[PDB]
Each structure stands twice: as structure tokens, then as C-alpha cells.
């Protein structure tokens, strides 16, 4: 996992995510959608062959919180949800 920043405006953050694909990117984007302070959140794959493992992101906030902070909260929410689902699965198996 490597982050390569494309451009940074006053409230916009564009970056690459090397080593990832649609699986993590779509989850991260839809978790960012849950934040009320995020106005724009989207990802795309520039080329399915050359850029297969390098999606491009774009996070825009309303200025209340930074886009990096929004991404951090989205990742923490993903972590907590995955832990809760794992706990429920472990409880239901036994």
C-alpha cells in the first residue's frame, strides 16, 4: 500500500493507492459517502491493464474537516465494522 498524491486544493485531495484494487477502493469510497462532511467522494481505474492495481481517488470536504481526516475516519469505520462482523461470525459459528 502506497499513497501518491496527485494534487491538493484547499479542500480537495487527489491521490493514488498502489497495490489495491476495486475491493478496497469501492468500500473506502462508500464508507466516505457515509460522512456528512464529505461533499464529493469517488474513485476510478484509469486503465484495466496498466493501472489495474492503482486506482485514483478524489475526496472533497466542506472545510469542517480535512480530506485526510475524513479518509482516516472512513478507514477506522471499515476496521470497526469488519471487527464487529468477525465477532458476530465467531459467535454464530459456535
Amino acid at each position: 500500500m502506497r499513497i501518491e498524491v496527485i494534487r491538493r486544493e484547499e479542500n480537495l485531495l487527489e491521490f493514488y493507492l498502489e497495490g489495491e484494487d476495486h475491493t478496497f477502493a469501492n468500500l473506502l469510497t462508500e464508507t466516505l459517502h457515509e460522512n456528512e462532511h464529505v461533499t464529493f467522494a469517488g474513485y476510478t481505474i484509469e486503465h484495466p491493464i496498466t493501472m489495474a492495481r492503482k486506482p485514483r481517488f478524489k475526496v472533497v470536504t466542506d472545510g469542517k474537516i480535512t480530506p485526510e481526516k475524513a479518509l482516516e475516519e472512513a478507514a477506522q469505520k471499515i476496521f470497526d465494522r469488519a471487527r464487529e462482523v468477525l465477532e458476530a461470525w465467531k459467535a454464530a459459528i459456535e
Binding site: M1, E20, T23, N26, E30, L71, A82
Partner: protein, 256 residues
């Protein structure tokens, strides 16, 4: 988050997950399909091969053979996989059948799960000797490392009003196809735990007579395995992989 195990089998499991969002289910399915690592043959060193099949064909057939993956010994949820190599060797002389169970593994925990898989046929005077090397890998790089097949569907309830003619035919069809049916005085409800398709005569009633509703956040998952890993450990491994990926992304964000 709640789980309801519909059916448990040694090779597959069916369950309903609730309280989860659609891209989360998609991410879990993709992590199970392509991110959960197993043991598979990657390189074969051939000493002699007098069989009709070529070396590449035999190597590919050996790669398709499932191998038991000890989840306790190796951290399968780690982002970096262990570079542990397991050597499988065979020395067979024809005539006869060469099975997957005839391979001699250097590790007890890493052996072919199915010992009745044919590999090649040997004629009289034909011998096959090779050393097969197996290592951990992910399903995204090659299909030989996939732990199994996984898919899910929306948990939908089909409401058929009693005013619709021949509703008893639909009820008995749903009962025959193993679907839960709830009967009331006004309408019947069919829980689509499997793929349910209405006949042609009921297509005209789907606009106003028969209505299908989708339960929000409920999915019916089907996870299968070929013997490489237990069918319950794959979901836990995928969830731990997602947790580790989130932690790594947080670390990269802090690095920024």
C-alpha cells in the same frame, strides 16, 4: 450484525448476514474469492516424463490439485505471505493410473486434500518422476490459489396476493424448491433464500398482483471450499485481511 446458518456441509456453508451494507458484502465476497491465500503448486522440476501429456499440461494439472493449508501454523491474514516451500515428489511406473494421493509431501500439514484426482495415464514402460514445489499465494494472481467459490444474492420477499389465480401452484413450487413460505388470509410471502423465477403465466401479475420487496441489508451467502481450508475459517481470514488492510491504509495516511 447477525448471522443465520441455513445449511452446514463439510465442503460448503450457506448463511444469511444482516445489518451490513451492499459494498461491504461485495468486498467480503471479493476478499474470499481473490485475497484468501492457500497452498498450490507453482513450479515443477521434471526428471522424466514418457506420458502422452506434455510437461506444461502435467504441471497445470498439478497446480489445480487442492492442498491443505494449515491456518494455525501460518498467518494467512498477513499482507505479506510466508515464503515457505513444500516439495511434493512422485515416482511412478506404468501401466496404471497416477492419482493425487500418490504424491509424497515433505510436510505433513501440506498434502493434497483429495487423493482420488487422476493426473495422467501411463502405458507400459512409461515412467513419470518430478518434484513439485508449492507455496502460498493469492487468488488474484492465479486461480490455483483460490480457496473456493463464493457468491451472494439479495434476500427478497415475494408477496403473492390471493386474488392472483393459481397462487397455490406458486406456493407448492416454492415449497418444492425448498423456500420458506408464510401463508396468510390476504397474501402469501416467499423468502427467496435461493434463485426463484416465476413461470411465464405469472409474468403479467408482477406489476400489480405479485410484488417483490428487498430486505435492506440482508444477503444470502454461499461459500464453498475444495478442502484447502475449513469453510468457516475463510470468512474469518477475509475479515482479518480487511482489518489489516484498513490498518495499513491508516498507517500510510499517518505517513502522509
Amino acid at each position: 450484525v447477525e448471522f443465520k446458518i441455513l445449511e452446514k456441509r463439510p465442503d460448503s456453508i450457506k448463511f444469511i448476514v444482516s445489518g451490513v451494507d451492499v459494498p461491504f458484502a461485495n468486498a467480503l465476497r471479493r476478499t474470499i474469492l481473490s485475497e484468501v491465500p492457500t497452498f498450490a503448486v507453482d513450479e515443477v522440476e521434471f526428471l522424466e516424463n514418457d506420458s502422452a501429456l506434455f510437461d506444461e499440461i502435467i504441471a497445470h494439472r498439478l497446480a489445480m490439485i487442492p492442498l491443505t493449508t494449515p491456518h494455525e501454523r501460518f498467518s494467512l491474514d498477513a499482507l505479506e505471505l510466508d515464503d515457505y516451500t513444500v516439495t511434493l515428489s512422485l515416482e511412478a511406473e506404468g501401466p496404471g493410473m497416477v492419482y493425487s494421493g500418490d504424491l509424497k509431501s515433505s510436510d505433513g500439514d501440506v498434502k493434497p486434500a483429495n487423493p482420488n484426482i487422476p493426473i495422467v495415464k501411463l502405458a507400459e514402460g512409461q515412467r513419470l518422476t518430478f518434484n513439485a514445489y508449492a507455496r502460498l499465494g493469492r487468488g488474484k494472481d492465479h486461480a490455483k490459489w483460490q480457496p473456493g467459490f463464493v457468491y451472494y444474492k439479495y434476500l427478497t420477499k415475494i408477496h403473492v396476493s390471493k386474488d392472483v389465480p393459481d397462487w397455490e401452484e406458486l406456493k407448492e413450487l416454492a415449497e418444492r424448491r425448498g423456500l420458506p413460505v408464510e401463508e396468510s388470509d390476504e397474501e402469501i410471502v416467499i423468502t427467496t433464500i435461493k434463485a426463484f423465477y416465476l413461470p411465464r403465466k405469472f409474468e403479467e401479475h408482477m406489476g400489480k398482483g405479485i410484488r417483490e420487496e428487498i430486505v435492506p441489508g440482508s444477503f444470502v451467502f454461499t461459500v464453498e471450499t475444495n478442502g484447502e481450508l475449513p469453510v468457516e475459517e475463510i470468512v474469518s481470514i477475509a475479515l482479518k485481511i480487511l482489518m489489516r488492510k484498513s490498518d495499513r491504509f491508516i498507517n500510510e495516511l499517518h505517513k502522509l
